[PDB]
Design an enzyme around this catalytic site. Structure first.
Site, PDB file in Angstrom:
ATOM      1  N   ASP B  28       0.832  -1.193   0.000  1.00  0.00           N
ATOM      2  CA  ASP B  28       0.000   0.000   0.000  1.00  0.00           C
ATOM      3  C   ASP B  28       0.874   1.253   0.000  1.00  0.00           C
ATOM      4  O   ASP B  28       1.648   1.482   0.931  1.00  0.00           O
ATOM      5  CB  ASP B  28      -0.930  -0.005   1.215  1.00  0.00           C
ATOM      6  N   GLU B  78      30.296   6.259   4.340  1.00  0.00           N
ATOM      7  CA  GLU B  78      30.279   4.852   4.699  1.00  0.00           C
ATOM      8  C   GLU B  78      30.044   4.122   3.390  1.00  0.00           C
ATOM      9  O   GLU B  78      29.688   2.944   3.379  1.00  0.00           O
ATOM     10  CB  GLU B  78      29.169   4.526   5.712  1.00  0.00           C
ATOM     11  N   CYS B 110      26.295   6.856   9.883  1.00  0.00           N
ATOM     12  CA  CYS B 110      25.712   8.161   9.575  1.00  0.00           C
ATOM     13  C   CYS B 110      26.113   9.318  10.487  1.00  0.00           C
ATOM     14  O   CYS B 110      25.641  10.443  10.310  1.00  0.00           O
ATOM     15  CB  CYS B 110      24.188   8.029   9.565  1.00  0.00           C
ATOM     16  N   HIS B 232      19.018  13.236  12.564  1.00  0.00           N
ATOM     17  CA  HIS B 232      19.534  12.428  11.466  1.00  0.00           C
ATOM     18  C   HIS B 232      18.257  11.849  10.864  1.00  0.00           C
ATOM     19  O   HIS B 232      17.382  11.405  11.603  1.00  0.00           O
ATOM     20  CB  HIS B 232      20.412  11.285  11.971  1.00  0.00           C
ATOM     21  N   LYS B 241       9.146   9.877  15.526  1.00  0.00           N
ATOM     22  CA  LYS B 241       9.050   8.980  16.668  1.00  0.00           C
ATOM     23  C   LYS B 241      10.044   9.375  17.749  1.00  0.00           C
ATOM     24  O   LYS B 241       9.702   9.413  18.932  1.00  0.00           O
ATOM     25  CB  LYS B 241       9.306   7.536  16.234  1.00  0.00           C
ATOM     26  N   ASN B 274      17.286   8.530   2.449  1.00  0.00           N
ATOM     27  CA  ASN B 274      18.434   8.528   3.342  1.00  0.00           C
ATOM     28  C   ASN B 274      19.746   8.701   2.571  1.00  0.00           C
ATOM     29  O   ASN B 274      19.993   7.997   1.596  1.00  0.00           O
ATOM     30  CB  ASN B 274      18.455   7.214   4.132  1.00  0.00           C
TER      31      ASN B 274
HETATM   32  C1  LIG Z   1      19.927   3.349   8.727  1.00  0.00           C
HETATM   33  C2  LIG Z   1      20.766   4.441   9.369  1.00  0.00           C
HETATM   34  O1  LIG Z   1      21.051   5.435   8.696  1.00  0.00           O
HETATM   35  C3  LIG Z   1      20.792   4.529  10.880  1.00  0.00           C
HETATM   36  C4  LIG Z   1      19.451   4.893  11.482  1.00  0.00           C
HETATM   37  O2  LIG Z   1      18.856   5.962  11.345  1.00  0.00           O
HETATM   38  S1  LIG Z   1      18.879   3.460  12.427  1.00  0.00           S
HETATM   39  C5  LIG Z   1      17.121   3.898  12.485  1.00  0.00           C
HETATM   40  C6  LIG Z   1      16.424   3.849  11.128  1.00  0.00           C
HETATM   41  N1  LIG Z   1      16.506   2.535  10.493  1.00  0.00           N
HETATM   42  C7  LIG Z   1      16.646   2.353   9.183  1.00  0.00           C
HETATM   43  O3  LIG Z   1      16.598   3.279   8.373  1.00  0.00           O
HETATM   44  C8  LIG Z   1      16.868   0.930   8.711  1.00  0.00           C
HETATM   45  C9  LIG Z   1      16.448   0.721   7.255  1.00  0.00           C
HETATM   46  N2  LIG Z   1      15.021   0.420   7.122  1.00  0.00           N
HETATM   47  C10 LIG Z   1      14.440  -0.677   7.603  1.00  0.00           C
HETATM   48  O4  LIG Z   1      15.047  -1.517   8.270  1.00  0.00           O
HETATM   49  C11 LIG Z   1      12.953  -0.863   7.297  1.00  0.00           C
HETATM   50  O5  LIG Z   1      12.713  -0.529   5.926  1.00  0.00           O
HETATM   51  C12 LIG Z   1      12.062  -0.019   8.207  1.00  0.00           C
HETATM   52  C13 LIG Z   1      12.311  -0.394   9.664  1.00  0.00           C
HETATM   53  C14 LIG Z   1      12.366   1.449   7.981  1.00  0.00           C
HETATM   54  C15 LIG Z   1      10.617  -0.300   7.866  1.00  0.00           C
HETATM   55  O6  LIG Z   1      10.352  -1.698   8.001  1.00  0.00           O
HETATM   56  P1  LIG Z   1       9.121  -2.388   7.258  1.00  0.00           P
HETATM   57  O7  LIG Z   1       8.941  -3.718   7.893  1.00  0.00           O
HETATM   58  O8  LIG Z   1       9.435  -2.472   5.807  1.00  0.00           O
HETATM   59  O9  LIG Z   1       7.804  -1.441   7.402  1.00  0.00           O
HETATM   60  P2  LIG Z   1       7.188  -1.583   8.901  1.00  0.00           P
HETATM   61  O10 LIG Z   1       8.206  -1.526   9.981  1.00  0.00           O
HETATM   62  O11 LIG Z   1       6.429  -2.860   8.931  1.00  0.00           O
HETATM   63  O12 LIG Z   1       6.171  -0.381   9.120  1.00  0.00           O
HETATM   64  C16 LIG Z   1       6.326   0.837   8.403  1.00  0.00           C
HETATM   65  C17 LIG Z   1       5.536   1.932   9.071  1.00  0.00           C
HETATM   66  O13 LIG Z   1       4.392   2.254   8.235  1.00  0.00           O
HETATM   67  C18 LIG Z   1       3.197   1.924   8.913  1.00  0.00           C
HETATM   68  N3  LIG Z   1       2.278   1.334   7.945  1.00  0.00           N
HETATM   69  C19 LIG Z   1       2.156   0.024   7.557  1.00  0.00           C
HETATM   70  N4  LIG Z   1       1.377  -0.141   6.514  1.00  0.00           N
HETATM   71  C20 LIG Z   1       0.823   1.118   6.317  1.00  0.00           C
HETATM   72  C21 LIG Z   1      -0.120   1.605   5.399  1.00  0.00           C
HETATM   73  N5  LIG Z   1      -0.676   0.858   4.440  1.00  0.00           N
HETATM   74  N6  LIG Z   1      -0.481   2.905   5.500  1.00  0.00           N
HETATM   75  C22 LIG Z   1       0.121   3.668   6.424  1.00  0.00           C
HETATM   76  N7  LIG Z   1       0.989   3.315   7.367  1.00  0.00           N
HETATM   77  C23 LIG Z   1       1.338   2.025   7.225  1.00  0.00           C
HETATM   78  C24 LIG Z   1       3.593   0.994  10.054  1.00  0.00           C
HETATM   79  O14 LIG Z   1       2.658   1.059  11.109  1.00  0.00           O
HETATM   80  C25 LIG Z   1       4.954   1.562  10.427  1.00  0.00           C
HETATM   81  O15 LIG Z   1       4.826   2.721  11.241  1.00  0.00           O
HETATM   82  P3  LIG Z   1       5.015   2.599  12.828  1.00  0.00           P
HETATM   83  O16 LIG Z   1       6.303   1.924  13.124  1.00  0.00           O
HETATM   84  O17 LIG Z   1       5.031   4.099  13.364  1.00  0.00           O
HETATM   85  O18 LIG Z   1       3.834   1.863  13.364  1.00  0.00           O
END
Ligand SMILES: CC(=O)CC(=O)SCCNC(=O)CCNC(=O)[C@H](O)C(C)(C)COP(=O)(O)OP(=O)(O)OC[C@H]1O[C@@H](n2cnc3c(N)ncnc32)[C@H](O)[C@@H]1OP(=O)(O)O
Ligand SMILES: CC(C)(COP(=O)([O-])OP(=O)([O-])OC[C@H]1O[C@@H](n2cnc3c(N)ncnc32)[C@H](O)[C@@H]1OP(=O)([O-])[O-])[C@@H](O)C(=O)NCCC(=O)NCCSC(=O)C[C@@](C)(O)CC(=O)[O-]
Lengths: 387, 387
Positions: B28, B78, B110, B232, B241, B274
């Site tokens: 979605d 990185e 980062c 960041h 969050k 990012n």
């Molecule tokens: C990475 C670095 O540079 C260092 C950092 O900042 S570490 C912290 C950030 N981490 C990262 O960027 C890691 C890279 N990304 C990831 O690991 C993943 O893509 C992610 C964690 C960002 C997302 O994981 P995902 O499993 O693909 O999506 P998911 O976690 O299930 O949920 C996505 C969000 O959209 C929401 N969502 C789900 N479906 C939705 C929909 N149809 N409509 C609206 N919202 C929806 C979920 O509720 C969730 O929000 P919340 O956590 O606030 O509840």
């Protein structure tokens, strides 16, 4: 005053005799012993990576008060094990340093430890109660039967920068020189460096001449003002050539003094090999412990990194510094190592490329009092800590 | 005072619509548009490596006179292309900066650009006539159909540090927090990072909380003292969050102000993605241009790097800073970009993995006024320079 308060190095418990390697390589041993000026080459067992070596160099000089006052842990290396995570984070952890500190790596070939201690000093400028831990850690690997193979080595050097240092005061005269050249480099993916041997010799000497010349111009100084010079050491003869290329204009007394100091400076390096970022600083330890420089005298240092970046700065010996060195321990570290045949050496080298563990071949049992890579699980490196 | 005198960024000319990627990935669209808060993803053409992107971000903010005053060129990344040669050397060359300068890379996920500008400041304490060029440049690549893929992006941010900065004065109140954790990392050899999705969210928030709490304690400050906060940005919701987990304690007026400031802060990041080390700083540009903060008002910044290392510091706006930003150019840079289907995107992506040149696909002829990777011969990268 701000400078090197404590300093120490660590090298792996194994080494191959250069005379033996020469024969095995079908070359005149003197080509190694005299030609490049290397006698024993440090050999890396898999249980020693840049992290464990780094932790080991630092462990003997870090006290509890240090763990509380260190505000930054900087790691200089060109032998990174992670493309993102700074090895400084694991070391900071292994050493138990207080949490509110910056941890990161600096990279620029063999040059990186210099901007680390210099910027460490700048950082401490208004922080008299803080300290900085700088760690140079690297594994110089060119590959079996490669051109650079004879200059290989591995080790680490740890330095504690602080106010009213016990050993050396860093002066405010550093001048760097950058020149884009491809004398030595290692593109992502390549396990070993690409190198233009002849060009790397010319690049080093040119970087040194440009840096020194500008330094001499800005500080209104000459070689006669220095008790001794200290250079980055890829192999002892490299620095000898670079020194010779500029001292001809100096007086006989100065020429004799710097030529003599250089020998004391490369004493330890002859039995280790190139350790990249730590080479200059391993040489500084050798110079401080093998020569009887008097407090108040000034040392001239030239840092080099292929690519290339060079830098010349000075440091002045602090009163009573001899009482803060560890010559006995360092002599012991080198002497108590275990020699390995050219055959075994090649086995170690191969296992290292793949991080193939082996508690027996690495003789892990002997390392109860040090840090070592005990295993890698789920792409996470685990370490054994001094019992 | 000393701080950011000039700041700019660059992103490649291509981008993929997030609603599309969502459809393609059979998810979605709102999951990306709202869930993670990303609308358009930057897409990397092979002719743009971290070096060309870095140079492009910097070229517009350095004058010929600056090339004479820049004493250090530091690159945070990185996404390195060499394990030894610092990308800072090639950029320093491409920009024609004077030779007597230090060039090197800093690395720690980062977080890296932060110790770079902070130590850049300490370096300038003694040199009022010099400047420091800091460049954050990265390619956040997780891999098609990977968990992290939706948060991908690429670009670079250039910042000129100097005395009496035209935009922001960096205050002396920074505090970092290190904690050994494996939330995100990329062992040598892996093209893509290893990541613990959920853990990475908790790690980020914990680091921010521990850093802020300690900062607040040391400075005797509170959220109410900040006109706005900047974080960041891996994806816009992540900062949201993090901010929400701390502003609950604040009063209604502060909560309203910081929530609004945050939206201005992540306005640009929403259409790029990012860019690792540059994320926080791209967000800073967004905040500076989208919000109308007044001189003397203070901004709170949190820098994060998986591994992990966090840092919270503040900066104070300089009167007239608006006249030193290129909002028009920036707004134009994003809008004038060309869109590409999820298909073109995936081809671009696969081509990038192996630097597969193609002047037709990368539409190289349009890049006459910018730097770009034009070829690699004998392991040496060649670049086209602005006509
Ligand atoms: C990475 C670095 O540079 C260092 C950092 O900042 S570490 C912290 C950030 N981490 C990262 O960027 C890691 C890279 N990304 C990831 O690991 C993943 O893509 C992610 C964690 C960002 C997302 O994981 P995902 O499993 O693909 O999506 P998911 O976690 O299930 O949920 C996505 C969000 O959209 C929401 N969502 C789900 N479906 C939705 C929909 N149809 N409509 C609206 N919202 C929806 C979920 O509720 C969730 O929000 P919340 O956590 O606030 O509840
Ligand atoms: C070091 C080289 C170039 C040697 O390369 P080589 O071909 O193996 O040995 P050589 O043929 O060049 O000559 C060896 C020396 O021994 C002599 N010799 C000849 N035969 C005999 C004999 N029988 N008995 C006695 N002497 C003998 C010979 O004359 C010569 O002395 P020189 O002419 O230079 O005065 C090569 O191994 C190499 O490329 N090594 C690595 C590169 C390097 O260390 N560069 C030095 C400066 S660049 C630097 O320090 C940066 C670096 C490398 O650390 C990268 C970074 O920063 O990360």
């Amino acid at each position: 005053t701000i400078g090197i308060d404590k300093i120490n190095f660590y090298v792996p418990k194994y080494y191959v005799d250069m005379a033996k390697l020469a024969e095995a390589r079908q070359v005149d041993p003197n080509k190694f012993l005299i030609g490049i000026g290397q006698t024993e080459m440090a050999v890396s067992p898999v249980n020693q990576d840049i992290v464990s070596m780094g932790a080991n160099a630092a462990k003997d000089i870090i006290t509890d008060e240090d763990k509380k006052k260190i505000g930054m842990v900087i790691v200089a290396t060109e032998s990174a094990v992670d493309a993102a995570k700074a090895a400084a984070v694991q070391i900071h952890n292994l050493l138990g340093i207080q949490p509110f500190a910056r941890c990161f790596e600096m990279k620029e070939a063999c040059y990186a430890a210099t901007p680390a201690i210099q910027l460490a000093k700048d950082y401490l400028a208004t922080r008299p109660n803080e300290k900085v831990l700088v760690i140079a850690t690297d594994t110089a690997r060119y590959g079996l039967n490669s051109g650079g193979e004879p200059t290989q080595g591995a080790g680490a050097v740890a330095m504690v920068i602080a106010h009213n240092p016990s050993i050396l005061a860093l002066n405010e005269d550093a001048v760097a020189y950058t020149e884009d050249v491809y004398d030595f480099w290692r593109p992502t993916g390549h396990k070993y460096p690409l190198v233009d041997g002849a060009l790397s010799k010319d690049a080093y000497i040119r970087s040194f001449q440009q840096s020194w010349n500008e330094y001499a111009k800005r500080q209104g100084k000459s070689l006669a003002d220095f008790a001794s010079l200290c250079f980055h050491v890829p192999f002892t003869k490299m620095g000898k050539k670079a020194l010779e290329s500029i001292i001809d204009n100096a007086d006989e007394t100065t020429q004799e003094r710097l030529r003599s100091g250089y020998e004391d400076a490369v004493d330890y390096n002859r039995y280790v090999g190139n350790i990249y970022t730590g080479s200059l600083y391993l040489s500084l330890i050798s110079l401080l412990e093998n020569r009887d420089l008097q407090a108040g005298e000034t040392i001239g240092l030239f840092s080099y990194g292929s690519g290339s970046v060079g830098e010349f700065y000075s440091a002045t010996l602090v009163e009573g510094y001899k009482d803060h060195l560890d010559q006995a321990a360092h002599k012991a570290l080198l002497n108590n190592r275990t020699e390995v045949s050219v055959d075994a050496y090649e086995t170690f080298f191969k296992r290292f490329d793949d991080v193939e563990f082996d508690e027996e071949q690495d003789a892990v049992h002997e390392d109860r009092h040090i840090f070592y890579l005990s295993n890698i699980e789920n792409n996470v490196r685990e370490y054994h800590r001094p019992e």
